[PDB]
Every structure is written in C-alpha cells, then in structure tokens.
Amino acid sequence: SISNLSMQTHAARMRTFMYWPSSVPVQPEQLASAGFYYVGRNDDVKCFCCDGGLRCWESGDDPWVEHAKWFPRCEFLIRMKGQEFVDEIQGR
Amino acid sequence: GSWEIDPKDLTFLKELGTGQFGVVKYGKWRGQYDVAIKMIKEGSMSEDEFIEEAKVMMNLSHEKLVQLYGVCTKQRPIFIITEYMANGCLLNYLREMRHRFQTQQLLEMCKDVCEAMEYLESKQFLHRDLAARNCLVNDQGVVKVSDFGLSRYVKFPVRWSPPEVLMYSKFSSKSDIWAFGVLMWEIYSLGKMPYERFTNSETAEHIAQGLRLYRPHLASEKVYTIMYSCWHEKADERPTFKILLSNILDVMDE
Ligand SMILES: [Zn+2]
C-alpha cells in the first residue's frame, strides 16, 4: 500500500523541494527519484510509500542506499532497485 | 470514565520493550496518529491505586510533559495510551555516544526538564522520583517527563533522594529540586551512575556527611553552580524551578 497519496509521482515529489535549503549537500532530483519529498522543516524528507522519515543529510550520500539501510521493507524500494540490492545494503 | 478509548481503532506496530509496570508497544490510533501503548501487567500495580494515578495524570497538560491520551479498562490487561516518544528513555539516549552531544545541547535538555517541573510546581504536584530513567525523548530531541506520581503505587531511588527523604522520609517541593540536580549531573555525565563507587547503603550515609556529586568534564563552572544550588543541606535554601529555569536561560545566553 501507499502512505502519502499526493506524492505518488516524481513530478509531484519535486514540487515540495521549492523552498529546500541550498546548503544541504544532497540534490532534490536524487531524493524525488528515491520516493522522497520535502516535509518543510530544515532537511526532513518522508517517503510516499513507507512514510520513512530521513534527516541530517550529509555529503557523499545516496538516497537509495539510505532507503535500504533504514527501511528495507519499503515496497517501492524493492520495486525500483530490486531485492538483490536491498539485501546487499542490509547485509552490512 | 469519559477518558476510555476503544482499542478497535488502535493498530499495533513495534514492541518498544518491557519496563516498569508493564510492556510498551508503539502503535497508530485511528490509522494516522502516533501513540505509545503501556500494557499494565496483571497485578503489577494496585487496582484501587490505578483510579487516583489516572485521574491526576488526565487533568494535567504541558508542552514539556508526556501527555496521557487515556485508558482501556474494559479488558485485561489495562492499557495506558500516551504521547509516542521515538528515542525513548533519556538515560539510553545519553548513554549512546553515537549522537556526539554538544554542551549547548545538554543545557537545552536541562531547560526542557525544568520547564515541565515548573508546571508540576504550580500544580503542587510532586514527582516523588525524578531521574533520567523516568524521562523520555522524542525524534526531535525534546526531553519530556513521565512516570510522575507512580512512586506511590505498585530498589529505592537513594542516589536521587535528599537528606530529609533518607533520614526522615519527608517529601517536599525541594525534594524534586535535589532529584533535578542529580538528573542535571546524569545529563552532563552522559548517563553515568551517580555515586558509582558507593553502594545504596554507603550513598545514604555519605550524603548525610556532606558528599556532593563532582563536576562532570562536560559541565562548566556556571552550570555546575546551577546543579550544586539544588544540593543544599537545608531544603529551605534550595531554589524553585522558576529560579532554576531563570539561571538556565541566563547561562544559555552567556
Ligand atoms: Zn519508502
């Protein structure tokens, strides 16, 4: 099932990053491709499928690697990157 | 009644662990609001005492207090639905060095506890047992107070007890002040045990002899004077949470 109805599409997820900080070393295009949308508070991003919240975004981060390390049960994540990837990230 | 909740609307999600009185389970009430479900173990607390415990915790609300959402009495075990605090116990939150806490952040935690304690001070409510063990932290890092009044229901917190509570068992508003002082030490020592080298029996004796907790490496002279003022032998010379918050906010802007 889906957690947030409004953010099902990448185009809709990108619209939240209108007032996203230009300070954070993570590009919104990467986050929106990984099912994330800006909540409105500093660097808080939630998932549309698993409602997975993620903040304190540092440089040299991959929104997909963070999606698997923290939320491996995410139905969208296994659909996009595949279970083989998800198990490899969780395997460490 | 009038505070009773139908468990048909509740949806359980993750067992947070077993603590005092019962097991705590994270759930979602009405499918959208985050709730913490305390499942009171059969016969752990007194049934008659559960009447006064709930009633006093209901008609009490604060920005820095763990809000009680209600009860579920019409089934065994009896449920306590409250405000969900993601990080859980403050003691475990401090003990995890994987946060790399700043002196300004630890002082902000003291502000949060003091703000809540000043509310209980105005309501003439005594915590009777104030420590990191009875404090919870949400996802944002905000520290709130819980398990209040629960000391009179259902080993003893000797290390948080003032001399009058030890020698004569006299509870006052200044007894929680001493407990807050030891809690201020707990935060700056990062979940370290107060009077670790001494047993509970030795702790009671040494407190009466004038021994006070040392300044932790994190706390500055100003902040140590704030927690030391709480440890006055004569309770009459201990400050109030109104005076304590004043000093906390003054040192915050220094
Ligand atoms: Zn997800």
Swiss-Prot record, chain A:
Lineage per the UniProt record: Eukaryota, Metazoa, Chordata, Craniata, Vertebrata
Entry superkingdom: Eukaryota
Residues noted as binding Zn(2+) in the record, renumbered to the chain: C47, C50, H67, C74
Ranges that cross the membrane: none
Annotated source species: Homo sapiens
Function comment: Multi-functional protein which regulates not only caspases and apoptosis, but also modulates inflammatory signaling and immunity, mitogenic kinase signaling, and cell proliferation, as well as cell invasion and metastasis. Acts as an E3 ubiquitin-protein ligase regulating NF-kappa-B signaling and regulates both canonical and non-canonical NF-kappa-B signaling by acting in opposite directions: acts as a positive regulator of the canonical pathway and suppresses constitutive activation of non-canonical NF-kappa-B signaling.
Subunit structure: Interacts with DIABLO/SMAC and with PRSS25; these interactions inhibit apoptotic suppressor activity. Interacts with CASP9. Interacts (via BIR domains) with TRAF2; the interaction is required for IKBKE ubiquitination. Interacts with E2F1, RIPK1, RIPK2, RIPK3, RIPK4, BIRC5/survivin and USP19. HSP90AB1. Interacts with UBXN1. Interacts with GSK3B. Interacts with several death receptors, inclusing FAS, TNFRSF10A and TNFRSF10B. Recruited to TNFRSF10B in the absence of receptor stimulation. When TNFRSF10B is stimulated, further recruited to the receptor and cleaved by caspases.
Tissue: Present in many fetal and adult tissues. Mainly expressed in adult skeletal muscle, thymus, testis, ovary, and pancreas, low or absent in brain and peripheral blood leukocytes.
Entry remark concerning the domains of this protein: The BIR domains mediate nuclear localization.
Annotated BIR repeat ranges: 10-77
Protein name: Baculoviral IAP repeat-containing protein 2
Location relative to the cell: Cytoplasm; Nucleus
Annotated family: Belongs to the IAP family.
Post-translational modification: Auto-ubiquitinated and degraded by the proteasome in apoptotic cells. Upon stimulation of death receptors, including TNFRSF10B, recruited to receptors and cleaved by caspases. Proteolytic fragments remain associated with the receptors. This cleavage presumably inactivates the protein.
Curated annotation (Swiss-Prot), chain B:
Positions of clofedanol binding: T82, E83, Y84, M85, L150
Effect of K38E: In XLA; loss of phosphorylation of GTF2I
Bilayer-spanning residue ranges: none
Effect of mutating R133Q: In XLA; severe; disturbs ATP-binding
Effect of D129N: In XLA; severe
UniProt superkingdom: Eukaryota
Residues where ATP binds: L16, G17, T18, G19, Q20, F21, G22, V23, V24, K38
Homology family: Belongs to the protein kinase superfamily. Tyr protein kinase family. TEC subfamily.
General function of this protein: Non-receptor tyrosine kinase indispensable for B lymphocyte development, differentiation and signaling. Binding of antigen to the B-cell antigen receptor (BCR) triggers signaling that ultimately leads to B-cell activation. After BCR engagement and activation at the plasma membrane, phosphorylates PLCG2 at several sites, igniting the downstream signaling pathway through calcium mobilization, followed by activation of the protein kinase C (PKC) family members. PLCG2 phosphorylation is performed in close cooperation with the adapter protein B-cell linker protein BLNK.
Protein name as it appears in the record: Tyrosine-protein kinase BTK
Organism: Homo sapiens
Lineage start: Eukaryota, Metazoa, Chordata, Craniata, Vertebrata
